[PDB]
């Protein structure tokens, strides 16, 4: 019985496992229950604290993945399968994971808490890309990741109802945050230095904890990678949420109480089978069951809340990858595929815009086409292809990120912004997709340090730089290495100067204006245009 | 005659003329100035189509410029060369339908290509007698036969009650046309070739040239065309019949006046009374908008110029079009608060938003917002220097650059041979401040070859530049191609096409080929803006 792997938390004793990282051992405590299993009458319900247990709970292995849709686009293809569930699916899935250095830290150590993405319909803390052993070993970090309910199980809402109030997946996240406050000291973590970080829907989740009062005592700093609470996909109105929930009910043979009672009788896969039939338009980068603006978890729209808050106590690191939109084109836009260069016609570009901007009126669509067309070469297939990616990337990620950065900075927050531009040498997607949504993550987590993965020696060094930025931020609220010069320094993002840095193999380069002209179009003009219809 | 210069005596259809021997720097030229081409459009003839000049007896003296058509005189900067150079330099009169002819001395023995200049001035002003339109240099250096005519402007030339007999509209354009017909009949007497006639004009004159391209009865009267900083399409060059009627009746009201009775009352009014009130009839506070302009009538123009350049077969057409570097700047000091020739005109964001409403008076709030969105530098949204230059760009692109780009692309798509330029040289002699750059109208002195005048103090390099441009223009007039065939050495000027969109830069450096005439920005003005107005 290794006493380094034996921990007492409030619920009882745990036994972890000594894992090997390339440079030494780490302590891993995997599959710790933080909630009562949300099964049976508990489906759609807020999470309840896990009851205490007897003896020593085995925490040597990952627990089940929250029940979710599984991707079938490219079966066997690593580019897609890397995101697919790597453990059995179950509604019994509210478990978290803790990596610490071996042996347990001598002094209280800053905690990083990872919240996975996956469009609020998918994801798991057990994925190889979220492996916290490298950060734990190299940077001495205490890293936590939790599973949270996704899809209908996490976000089906009949706003106002008792039995499906909505946002329970976010409440799963919050309960794990509370668990960290109560228990992390036993692992050598400092509950007074907690940094949330996440990507895509996980970044949006991080943003919603910033905007939700009861979450504010649970962390001190935040990193939002390629995702925001504001924007076109991260939330729905109460009316649209109810609309989608009732439609789904009808589809599966089902007042709120009776409707939800019937839904709870249905096998999990029946719900998943019909998850995608409730979207109002044919679209991409749009998800059926996402957080709802209810007046509860969120007192108002994220756009409203980031515009009025006092965020002076907040430090935030936000950024995007070079090609945010490319991943999504192969999943719905005719003409795109990972198996060719996806050179498209102008008719295909126009068709793609209606799909990429599903809420657009004819005039709004024309405006987007006008902005992104190269009028010198308006029929060039290479430009039209890359512009289609830009439309989806800017609309859904880059410009909402720029807006969040600008808004938070204006309201007194300390903001650092980045663009991640390095394409992994081991990338399995074709060249035209560039640096796609999600492909900075393997570097932040230090996967190039894994000798079995065949990253270049430059990529190993690049990864260590990023781990240092991230952990320095967690420690200080400042990614800058507090012992360096001639670097150059990573300056805070401001509304005026709008400074951000490029993250690639080259040293930091300071740039100004995050797609400033283009994002002014998306953030300022487009809503006017939709309002006028 | 008998004791006079026998080389200055010429007969035309109306009778005998006596011209004058002028000195140009390289030698003498023949000038026949103030030749009447119409009966004076006075009294009962006011607002009426011109009637051909009835033959006169004896030898008419054609040695001096004639009257300027009655018009508003500019008062913004008294005694300032920058404005006064455009002001009338002869007596203002409704008796103003006269034309001028410059030829080599002695007159060419073989038929010589003819250039016909049509002045601009927003259809409310201008004269063929201005020093910047002096035809002696083109005549002497290039051997050109150059003709320029006065045409009625303002109410006198363009007040219209569409459908009426007594004020049918577009009579200023009919004046121009009558002059073209005069050239067809008489220019051979001067050594000119009526089978090789090239029209050129700037601003409203360029728009006029475009009207003649689009009007059927003008089409046998010329063979090639040059449009400098002006087009028949666009927001200022024409008004609808309903708006022309609206403006005419309002003007009538303002001077104390059934169309026949209204026009009859208008004819009793002193010329100056019409001028004193002509600027009170614009529907909005604006710049680059003129009260009395050509009207879309179904007659002179069978449809809007926009429709006409979209459906025509223009295979027979060779056309040279272009713009200057800073089309918008001149207009800012005349209507937008914060702008002046006497300071650097750095403006606030509030002054920029207000200027946009004035520079785009037809715009709804949403359209104006779109313009502001497009022209703002969102990295420095309140930078006064950028806002000032952006305001200029808004006015220049909207009124000139993008209508020119549209005209070039449309005509080329319909089969025409198009050559396009941007003129980027600022004269060393320019009296306007530096922030205005190369303003509307300031390529003209170079085309006409004024730098060749020793007394004007242009640089040696500017003299050479001027001679280059005169060659481009006369080559085009002669052949429909501005390039010199014997010079395969010097950079070639390629035709503008929709596919490649090639145009050249005109400056002190050799020709440089560029592609896309403000492609993104003009796509906004030409394609999107109209959609936005409709919604
Ligand atoms: C979490 C990183 N992410 C980065 C792409 C991969 C995971 N899938 S997804 O939800 O984003 C998604 C979107 C569209 C189509 C399929 C799909 F899985
Ligand atoms: C014909 C050359 N043009 C080139 C500028 C100078 C003549 N003035 S204008 O009609 O264009 C004009 C416009 C606005 C305000 C005053 C004004 F005279
Ligand atoms: C790429 O692949 C898809 C499906 O495989 C196809 O529809 C598309 O036409 C291809 N692109 C080409 C042929 O340019
Ligand atoms: C320049 O002059 C104009 C006209 O007098 C005035 O409106 C403007 O405020 C002046 N600008 C500056 C910076 O002095
Ligand atoms: C140029 O020559 C001299 C400069 O010394 C001056 O007297 C004359 O007025 C100038 N001419 C013009 C048109 O500026």
From Swiss-Prot, chain B:
InterPro entries to which the protein is assigned, alphabetical: AB_hydrolase_fold, AChE-related_enzymes, AChE_tetra, CarbesteraseB, Carboxylesterase_B_AS, Carboxylesterase_B_CS, Cholinesterase
Topology versus the membrane: Peripheral membrane protein
Entry annotated with the keyword Signal: yes
Catalytic residues (positions): 203 (acyl-ester intermediate), 327 (charge relay system), 440 (charge relay system)
Entry-listed glycosylation sites: 258, 343, 457
Keyword terms: Cell membrane, Disulfide bond, Glycoprotein, GPI-anchor, Hydrolase, Lipoprotein, Membrane, Neurotransmitter degradation, Secreted, Serine esterase, Signal, Synapse
Catalysis performed (reactions): acetylcholine + H2O = choline + acetate + H(+)
GO BP terms, alphabetized: acetylcholine catabolic process; acetylcholine receptor signaling pathway; cell adhesion; osteoblast development; positive regulation of cold-induced thermogenesis; receptor internalization; regulation of receptor recycling; retina development in camera-type eye
Pfam families: AChE_tetra, COesterase
Enzyme class: hydrolase
Gene Ontology, cellular component aspect: basement membrane; cell surface; extracellular space; Golgi apparatus; neuromuscular junction; perinuclear region of cytoplasm; plasma membrane; side of membrane
Domain of life (superkingdom): Eukaryota
Entry GO MF terms: acetylcholine binding; acetylcholinesterase activity; collagen binding; identical protein binding; laminin binding; protein homodimerization activity; serine hydrolase activity
Tissue: Predominates in most expressing tissues except erythrocytes where a glycophospholipid-attached form of ACHE predominates.
Subcellular compartments: Synapse; Secreted; Cell membrane
CDD domains registered for this protein in UniProt: Esterase_lipase (cd00312)
The protein's Enzyme Commission number: 3.1.1.7
Disulfide bridge partners, by residue number: 69-96, 257-265, 402-522
Assembly with partners or alone: Isoform H generates GPI-anchored dimers; disulfide linked. Isoform T generates multiple structures, ranging from monomers and dimers to collagen-tailed and hydrophobic-tailed forms, in which catalytic tetramers are associated with anchoring proteins that attach them to the basal lamina or to cell membranes. In the collagen-tailed forms, isoform T subunits are associated with a specific collagen, COLQ, which triggers the formation of isoform T tetramers, from monomers and dimers. Interacts with PRIMA1.
Family statement: Belongs to the type-B carboxylesterase/lipase family.
Note: Synapses usually contain asymmetric molecules of cholinesterase, with a collagen-like part disulfide-bonded to the catalytic part. A different, globular type of cholinesterase occurs on the outer surfaces of cell membranes, including those of erythrocytes. This is the catalytic subunit of an asymmetric or soluble form of ACHE.
Role according to the record: Terminates signal transduction at the neuromuscular junction by rapid hydrolysis of the acetylcholine released into the synaptic cleft.
Record protein name field: Acetylcholinesterase
Native organism: Mus musculus
Gene that this sequence comes from: Ache
């Amino acid at each position: 019985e290794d006493p380094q792997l034996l921990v007492r938390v409030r619920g009882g004793q745990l036994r972890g496992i000594r894992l090997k990282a390339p440079g030494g051992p780490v302590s891993a405590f995997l599959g710790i229950p933080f909630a009562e299993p949300p099964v049976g009458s508990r489906r759609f319900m807020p999470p309840e604290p896990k009851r205490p247990w007897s003896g020593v709970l085995d925490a040597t292995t990952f627990q089940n993945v929250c029940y979710q849709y599984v991707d079938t686009l490219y079966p066997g293809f690593e580019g897609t399968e890397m995101w697919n569930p790597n453990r059995e699916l179950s509604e019994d899935c509210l478990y978290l994971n803790v990596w610490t250095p071996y042996p347990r830290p001598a002094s209280p150590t800053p905690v990083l808490i990872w919240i996975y993405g996956g469009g609020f319909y998918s994801g798991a803390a057990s994925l190889d890309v979220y492996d916290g052993r490298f950060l734990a070993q190299v940077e001495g970090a205490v890293l936590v990741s939790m599973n949270y309910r996704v899809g209908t199980f996490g976000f089906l809402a009949l706003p106002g109802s008792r039995e499906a109030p909505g946002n329970v997946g976010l409440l799963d996240q919050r309960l794990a945050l509370q668990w960290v406050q109560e228990n992390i000291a036993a692992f050598g973590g400092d509950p007074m230095s907690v940094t949330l970080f996440g990507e895509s829907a996980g970044a949006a989740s991080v943003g919603m904890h910033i905007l939700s009062l009861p979450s504010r005592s649970l962390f001190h700093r935040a990193v939002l990678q390629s995702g925001t609470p504001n924007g076109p996909w991260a939330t729905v109105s109460a009316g649209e949420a109810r609309r989608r929930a009732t439609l789904l009910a009808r589809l599966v043979g089902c007042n709120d109480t009776e409707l939800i009672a019937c839904l709870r009788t249905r096998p999990a896969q029946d719900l998943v089978d019909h998850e995608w039939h409730v979207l109002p338009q044919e679209s991409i980068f749009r998800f059926s069951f996402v957080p709802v603006v209810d007046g509860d978890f969120l007192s108002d729209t994220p756009e409203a809340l980031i515009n009025t808050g006092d965020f002076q106590d907040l430090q935030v690191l936000v950024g995007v990858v070079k090609d945010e939109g490319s991943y999504f084109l192969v999943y719905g836009v005719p003409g795109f595929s990972k198996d060719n260069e996806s050179l498209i016609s102008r008719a295909q570009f126009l068709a793609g815009v209606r799909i990429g901007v599903p809420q657009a009126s004819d005039l709004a669509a024309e405006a987007v086409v006008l902005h992104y067309t190269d009028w010198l070469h308006p029929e060039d297939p290479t430009h039209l292809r890359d512009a289609m990616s830009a439309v989806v990337g800017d609309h859904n990620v880059v410009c909402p990120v720029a807006q969040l950065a600008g808004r938070l900075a204006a309201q007194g927050a300390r903001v650092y912004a980045y663009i991640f531009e390095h394409r992994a040498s081991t990338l399995t997607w074709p060249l035209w997709m560039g640096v796609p949504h999600g492909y900075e993550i393997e570097f932040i987590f230090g996967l190039p340090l894994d000798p079995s993965l065949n990253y270049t020696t430059e990529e190993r060094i690049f990864a260590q730089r990023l781990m240092k930025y991230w952990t320095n931020f967690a420690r200080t609220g400042d990614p800058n290495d507090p012992r360096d010069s001639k670097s150059p320094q990573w300056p805070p993002y401001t509304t005026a100067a709008q400074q951000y840095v490029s993250l690639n193999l080259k040293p930091l380069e300071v740039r100004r204006g995050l797609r400033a002209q283009t994002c002014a179009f998306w953030n300022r003009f487009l809503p006017k245009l939709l309002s006028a219809t």
